[PDB]
């Protein structure tokens, strides 16, 4: 029984490392630079301690997404000359009254000493008046606006996070996993499938669903200060569009630099509205509330209210379908009381100057999309925030929250975990080296 | 085999196709393999054809993979097939130049006869379908004639010509 050496033994230790991307038109997330993907191995009698809220993959993905977002904004047009006094008037070709502003401003041409008086349409959320009236862009006193490249697409292309050689990613396949604790059924896949870098709040769009029933995953179900990632088993399809027939007009800011204005509108002016099947949403809410009654008691009243308040990005459901950023008002979704063919319409609002990652001093102007935008997605999860109670009430109010994109991407990298292999193993065995 | 129709004076945009979406060297030639236009790296070179002063390609479109052939001031003799050689293909389109007009420019009276003149390219079979505001949708061969001319017969007649399921609208001068 002398010390013997074994190489290639299957032993791992939890550790953090840099994971590259593999992806099966350019995008803000450079999937073209990712390696071409190709492999699933089951692990018998293994018990692995997972933790969705201490997973380093979430922070790594958030940093990578931010870096890819602000990298693609570097070679694009910089809209510094746009920060001028805009003489704006109401469009007047309707509930979208005043929400489309007709603004004219002095403008530089290819010659430095020649001025030009051009016009462009700006949404009311994109301009703030200065005390026809004088207006300026909403982000002329905080951030430098950098117009997004017209060719670069914002479409979420799936990416796969493959660990480097000598590392493995353990994928828990338990169908009743609350995000924390040992997972008695683990697998081992070198990459991560079904990862879509979608940006949204209060509604996880185009995500990966649960397997059998709606999962309530929270770090602290008792502490109300933490979010509650709900995940759906059956998708709730969302239908919505921008009925306005927009026209994109190119205005020169200077030599070889075009500012794609909003031009003019063709047809009638209609509010951007998001539609969810009322029966589908009601059934999904019933299933979800049945799930929450598990952690709060059967005789506990569950109440759903709209967002409490704050920034428009966290107050309203804000996605980016079609290249135009929506800020849909979800007050008509979470409004009910639960006691033990028609479609709900959501009055969205549209912005163009966006500061996605709550970054101070860096914003982006989204070029208007020509034609009519229609996007169909389906909600695979919610981000609810239980309000603080008085600990003596029967009702519990769950208002959608969010704002932390990491909380969105934690709904996908919850089942994975990166480990470092220790293939060198010492043990006793009846050998003696001659 | 794509076919397009001209109007004897306007421009025509015959487009090559590139699968690599990049600046692949291409060359436009007619049926006699006489070079007309061509990419050379990032610059443009024109072949020793009869379209020296007319042929042109939108240099800004070459990056996306579109290599058009703009032919300004179309002429009746310019009707021929043209070939792309983007990578190894023979993307071939045919250009037909139709010239339709009338001999009686302005000198006309009431109750007289009107005659048209269609100049079809050699080696083609056109079909003229005239249209008039009063409703004489005259059908006939290459040459069309009108026997009634009155004050009611004013207005521009959008007489368009058909060949191989392709139709091109014209305009005519009628002042009474």
């Amino acid at each position: 029984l002398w010390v013997t050496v074994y190489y290639g033994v299957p032993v791992w230790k939890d550790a953090e490392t840099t994971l590259f991307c593999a992806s099966d038109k350019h995008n803000v997330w450079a999937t073209h630079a990712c390696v071409p993907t190709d492999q699933e191995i089951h692990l018998e009698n293994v018990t692995e301690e997972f933790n969705m809220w201490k997973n380093n993959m979430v922070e790594q993905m958030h940093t990578d997404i931010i870096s890819l977002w602000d990298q693609s904004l570097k070679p694009c047009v910089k809209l510094t000359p746009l920060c001028v006094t805009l003489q704006c008037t109401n469009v007047t070709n309707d509930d979208m009254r005043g929400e489309l502003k007709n603004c004219s401003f002095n403008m530089t041409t290819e010659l430095r000493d020649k001025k030009q008086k051009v016009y462009s349409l700006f949404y009311r959320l994109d301009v703030v008046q200065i005390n026809n009236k004088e207006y300026r862009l909403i982000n002329c006193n905080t951030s430098a606006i950098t117009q997004a490249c017209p060719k670069v697409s914002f479409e979420p292309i799936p990416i796969h996070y493959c660990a480097p050689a000598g590392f493995a990613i353990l994928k828990c396949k338990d169908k009743k996993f609350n995000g924390t604790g040992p997972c008695p059924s683990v697998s081992t896949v070198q990459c991560t499938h079904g990862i879509k870098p979608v940006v949204s709040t209060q509604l996880l769009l185009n995500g990966s669903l649960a397997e059998e029933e709606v999962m309530i995953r929270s770090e602290n179900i008792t502490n109300n200060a933490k979010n509650i990632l709900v995940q759906f088993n059956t998708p709730v399809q969302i239908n919505c569009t921008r009925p306005n027939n927009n026209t994109r007009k190119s205005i020169r800011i200077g030599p070889g630099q075009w500012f794609y204005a909003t031009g003019d509108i063709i047809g009638d002016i209609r509010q951007a509205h998001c539609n969810v099947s009322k029966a589908t949403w009601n059934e999904t809410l019933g299933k979800v509330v049945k799930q929450l009654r598990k952690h709060f008691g059967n005789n506990t009243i569950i109440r759903f209210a709209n967002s409490s308040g704050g920034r428009l990005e966290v107050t309203t459901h804000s996605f980016n379908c079609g290249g135009e950023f929506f800020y849909c008002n979800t007050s008509g979704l979470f409004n009910s009381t639960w006691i033990s063919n028609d479609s709900i319409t959501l009055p969205c609002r549209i912005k163009q100057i966006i500061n996605m990652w709550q970054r101070i001093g860096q914003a982006m102007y989204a070029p208007p999309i020509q034609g009519v935008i229609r996007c169909v997605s389906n909600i695979t999860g919610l981000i609810l925030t239980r309000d603080g109670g008085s600990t003596n009430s029967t009702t519990e109010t769950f208002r959608p929250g969010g704002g932390d994109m990491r909380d969105n991407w934690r709904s996908e990298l919850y089942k994975y975990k990166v480990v470092k292999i220790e293939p060198l193993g010492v043990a006793p065995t009846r050998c003696k080296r001659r | 085999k794509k076919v397009v129709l001209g109007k004897k004076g306007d421009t025509v945009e015959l487009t090559c196709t590139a699968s690599q979406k990049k600046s692949i060297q291409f060359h436009w030639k007619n049926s006699n393999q006489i070079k007309i236009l061509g990419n050379q790296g990032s610059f443009l070179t024109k072949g020793p054809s009869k379209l020296n002063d007319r042929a042109d390609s939108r240099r800004s479109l070459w990056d996306q993979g579109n290599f058009p052939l703009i032919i300004k001031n179309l002429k009746i003799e310019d009707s021929d097939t043209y070939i792309c050689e983007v990578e190894d293909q023979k993307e071939e389109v045919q250009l037909l130049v139709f010239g339709l007009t009338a001999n009686s420019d302005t000198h006309l009276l009431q109750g007289q006869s009107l005659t048209l003149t269609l100049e079809s390219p050699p080696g083609s079979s056109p079909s003229v379908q005239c249209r008039s505001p009063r409703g004489k949708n005259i059908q006939g061969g290459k040459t069309l004639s009108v026997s009634q001319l009155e004050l009611q017969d004013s207005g521009t007649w959008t007489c368009t010509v058909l060949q191989n399921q392709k139709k091109v609208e014209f305009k005519i001068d009628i002042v009474v």
């Binding site: 002398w2 010390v3 050496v5 290639g8 994971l19 191995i41 692990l43 009698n45 | -």
Partner: protein
């Protein structure tokens, strides 16, 4: 072929049977740097294990029994039960606090073996 680390729940005999696949999988713009440094990290991590194997006299051998005895206890147990039911992960957990000493003993034993062989080869 239980798979890459597939035998992690199997017996240590079964794992020692399938060490080769684990041995062969240890080597093979925002994404550009994460790709390059991942490759560098993988290469250096594999080379560290190879070098540690080399200075113990176990180069190129997946299994290499050595002369260093089982000093003290080090959770000795017995050879029968350890390789019949116990899994590799638990075993690594038990002796995680004596690994450096074991490595040092192996290094010194290999150096002694090389010196003795060089001494006896000159006779």
């Amino acid at each position: 072929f239980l798979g890459f680390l597939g035998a992690a729940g199997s017996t240590m005999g079964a794992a020692s049977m399938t060490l080769t696949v684990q041995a062969r999988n240890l080597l093979s713009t925002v994404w550009g740097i994460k790709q390059l440094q991942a490759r560098v990290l993988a290469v250096e991590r594999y080379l560290r294990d190879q070098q540690l194997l080399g200075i113990w006299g176990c180069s190129g051998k997946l299994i290499c029994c050595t002369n260093v005895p089982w000093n003290s206890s080090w959770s000795n147990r017995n050879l029968s039960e350890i390789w019949d039911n116990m899994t590799w992960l638990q075993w690594d957990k038990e002796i995680s606090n004596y690994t450096q000493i074991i490595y040092g003993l192996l290094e010194e034993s290999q150096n002694q073996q090389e010196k003795n062989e060089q001494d006896l080869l000159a006779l």
